[PDB]
Symmetry: C3
Subunit: 133 residues, 3 copies
């Protein structure tokens, strides 16, 4: 996979995603949302997309990742949308690991206006069908 | 893919997901969680599932998507579970883009009670194994 | 798939993920983040990874899942990183369903420092390219 910039790291075959780094120092105030730049640009393999999903270390710090969909055709810089959920300010240092990028396949289909057939054992059910237990 | 309702939009081949719309005007109070209706019903391809994941625009507004798993067998209406993380009220207009739907394959297996073999280079490690850097 | 522990449940072929249970009673204070133990260990199929993603029932309760990436090579105990976003304390009972585990394939590639070609119809665009509507 062709990449531009230095904000991404190789991973081993047994690891699911690639570590993303912060391109510059970022300061998030309580409840604030910013689009952390990674300084990375890439060309995803045809038929695949990239998923930005959080890491253990930063997640347990009160930070979450929003959005997270890198389109196959995207050619711009990858940004990590992060929200600070703590009641205090947080600071993400330059080149600090902030997220993961996982390469997943996506199916492309045309949407056919039709009629949904109740041909399944669940059909209508949702939102707690088997209970809490 | 057969779909019912008007709350979903075609996407181009290079895009990963389909845009989901709000079926009606929704008002989220600070810290509130509601299941935004999309008025959409669908029949996912056998062996696949649907993933509800946020978009750039709304994410950076202090809104997040919870849950997000549409089962292959689901036949009901798709709802987007959204939480308002800001300290103010937010309003999602009718037919406003609120999320993305991405079609991913899922593996089905039987769970075999057995013994995990420490046959890997990580094995036990987790939660910040290489540090912050 | 070989598994150890009792904190996971079989699923039917039409369902995308497996239900994860809390290994012990957990008490989350407002805004708190804890790594809920599941008491589960597993050996993911080669080339695949596990995704921890929330469920309907608990999501609409003000609880969210952070991180969520189980590496193919992981051999330790699976933990669910949960944040309490409400203004009150929440309690997750023992063996209560708290999340879902979905088995997804991941592509492994080497990162080739190169030059991104503006060979797509989007290329640079991102963060609200078609508007809100
Ligand atoms: O964001 C979401 C999550 C789930 N569902 C629907 O809810 C069903 C799952 O509900 P269920 O009670 O079976 O389990 P849970 O999602 O609580 O684990 C899915 O098939 C669909 C939905 O519409 N939107
Ligand atoms: O929600 C999560 C996220 C991660 N892990 C475990 O933590 C390991 C990853 O930890 P590591 O320190 O290697 O990196 P990080 O998740 O901090 O990026 C995975 O293999 C597993 C887990 O149990 N639950
Ligand atoms: O966390 C994210 C989410 C999106 N993008 C970029 O933003 C583009 C999508 O933006 P667009 O305006 O097309 O739609 P939206 O993400 O608002 O649905 C993707 O191709 C890429 C990004 O860098 N990081
Ligand atoms: Mg979340």
């Amino acid at each position: 996979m062709i990449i531009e910039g230095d904000g991404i790291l190789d991973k081993r075959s047994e690891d699911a995603g690639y570590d993303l780094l912060a391109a510059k120092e970022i300061h998030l105030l309580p409840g604030e949302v910013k689009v952390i730049p990674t300084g990375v640009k890439l060309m995803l393999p045809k038929g695949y997309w990239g998923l930005i999903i959080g890491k253990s270390s930063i997640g347990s710090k009160g930070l979450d990742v929003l959005g997270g969909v890198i389109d196959e055709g995207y050619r711009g810089e990858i940004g990590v949308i992060m929200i600070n959920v703590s009641r205090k300010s947080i600071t993400l240092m330059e080149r600090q690991k902030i997220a993961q990028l996982i390469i997943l396949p996506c199916k492309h289909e045309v949407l056919e206006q039709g009629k949904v057939v109740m041909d399944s054992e669940r059909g209508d059910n949702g939102y707690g069908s088997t209970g809490v237990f």
